Amino acid sequence: YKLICYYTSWSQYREGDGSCFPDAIDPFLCTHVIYSFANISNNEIDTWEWNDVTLYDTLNTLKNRNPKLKTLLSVGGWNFGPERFSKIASKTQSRRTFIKSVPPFLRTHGFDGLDLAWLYPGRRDKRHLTALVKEMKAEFAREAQAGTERLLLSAAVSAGKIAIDRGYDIAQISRHLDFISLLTYDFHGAWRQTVGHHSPLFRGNSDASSRFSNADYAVSYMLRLGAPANKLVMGIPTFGRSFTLASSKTDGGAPISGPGIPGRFTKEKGILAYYEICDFLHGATTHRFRDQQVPYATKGNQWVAYDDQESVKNKARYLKNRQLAGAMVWALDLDDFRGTFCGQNLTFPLTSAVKDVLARV
Ligand SMILES: *[C@H]1O[C@H](CO)[C@@H](O[C@H]2O[C@H](CO)[C@@H](O[C@H]3O[C@H](CO)[C@@H](O)[C@H](O)[C@@H]3O)[C@H](O)[C@H]2NC(C)=O)[C@H](O)[C@H]1NC(C)=O
Numbered sequence: 413y414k415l416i417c418y419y420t421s422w423s424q425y426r427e428g429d430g431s432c433f434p435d436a437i438d439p440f441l442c443t444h445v446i447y448s449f450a451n452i453s454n455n456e457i458d459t460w461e462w463n464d465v466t467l468y469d470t471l472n473t474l475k476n477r478n479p480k481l482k483t484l485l486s487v488g489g490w491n492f493g494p495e496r497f498s499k500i501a502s503k504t505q506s507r508r509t510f511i512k513s514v515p516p517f518l519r520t521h522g523f524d525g526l527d528l529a530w531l532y533p534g535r536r537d538k539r540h541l542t543a544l545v546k547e548m549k550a551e552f553a554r555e556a557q558a559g560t561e562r563l564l565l566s567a568a569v570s571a572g573k574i575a576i577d578r579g580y581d582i583a584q585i586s587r588h589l590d591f592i593s594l595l596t597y598d599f600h601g602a603w604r605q606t607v608g609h610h611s612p613l614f615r616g617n618s619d620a621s622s623r624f625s626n627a628d629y630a631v632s633y634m635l636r637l638g639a640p641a642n643k644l645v646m647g648i649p650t651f652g653r654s655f656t657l658a659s660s661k662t663d664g665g666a667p668i669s670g671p672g673i674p675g676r677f678t679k680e681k682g683i684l685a686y687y688e689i690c691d692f693l694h695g696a697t698t699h700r701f702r703d704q705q706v707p708y709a710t711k712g713n714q715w716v717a718y719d720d721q722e723s724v725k726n727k728a729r730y731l732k733n734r735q736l737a738g739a740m741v742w743a744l745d746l747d748d749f750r751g752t753f754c755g756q757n758l759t760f761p762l763t764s765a766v767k768d769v770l771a772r773v
Pocket residue numbers: 451452453454459460461
């Protein structure tokens with residue numbers, strides 16, 4: 413079983429214990445660690461943070477302790493304009509340029525592969541996305557002729573049915589990618605004013621429309637569209653989503669006035685690190701959707717949708733029963749990496765939970 417874990421560059425600037433460097437990663441925790449977000453300049457892959465070269469090296473030294481540990485660098489991300497991506501892949505001239513620039517880069521800094529994080533291609537992009545993948549794999553296959561281990565090529569893909577139909581040719585790209593990460597944790601849409609869970613496992617016998625907004629459907633749809641189970645990786649969130657209640661109503665469907673207040677270390681409205689959530693829980697009321705098998709908490713006018721050890725284990729069991737390749741965890745820096753916030757002196761409680769399920773078979 414694979415266990416793909418993302419590490420984000422910007423988590424280093426977090427104050428106090430929130431600060432996280434590659435240093436804190438247990439080399440034996442995951443099978444692959446993806447460094448989050450390289451950038452693109454003059455149609456060529458490039459660094460983002462001033463000290464990326466130092467961090468790249470810090471991350472890749474973990475491989476000295478765990479010889480089997482694979483690392484990848486990811487291009488794109490949320491702060492990377494989809495248009496910029498769209499622009500690079502349409503013109504075969506800039507595409508080939510971008511492509512040829514990658515292997516040397518990755519080889520210089522010690523990466524075993526590239527992760528494509530084109531955050532949401534549109535209807536006019538499908539054709540070009542396919543081209544990018546086809547050609548990149550071809551270039552990688554070629555570079556291996558030089559006597560070295562072929563570079564890996566993966567991609568983070570949307571879990572929403574509409575987004576999927578619109579910009580992805582799943583059948584095509586699947587035969588060229590090494591593994592696909594399903595972003596099964598962006599289900600509750602930031603568009604409108606209601607309380608809801610962003611990473612439900614099941615549909616839940618309790619609301620007819622938007623049966624497409626749960627991991628179960630997402631996985632079944634990908635399999636239907638032709639992606640091999642042995643290449644699909646289900647994404648599991650290590651963070652939670654917060655909301656500011658617009659009323660004293662706390663149950664499903666309650667009115668929302670806006671995102672929840674930021675966390676001490678995370679500092680972003682509407683998001684909270686799992687370790688921030690462990691602190692929040694004190695004096696909070698815990699609930700759990702039985703149909704969807706995920707929890708949520710409320711305190712004052714703040715409403716939080718998150719994942720605990722049990723929900724995460726549940727998702728992992730599901731993942732194993734459908735016979736998927738593994739799990740993907742978004743942000744090791746959002747889990748309790750120090751292991752000092754969430755009671756149990758355990759390090760990486762959430763990621764460890766997934767690993768336990770993947771490991772007992
Ligand atoms: C990776 O990706 C981008 C593309 O290379 C980097 O970017 C910007 O690139 C330069 C750097 O500041 C900007 O500014 C010059 O030109 C603009 C007009 O384009 C002038 O107005 C400005 O005064 C500068 O002379 C570009 O505007 C901007 N380009 C794009 C496409 O966004 C980007 O910096 C990088 N990594 C990071 C750290 O974000």
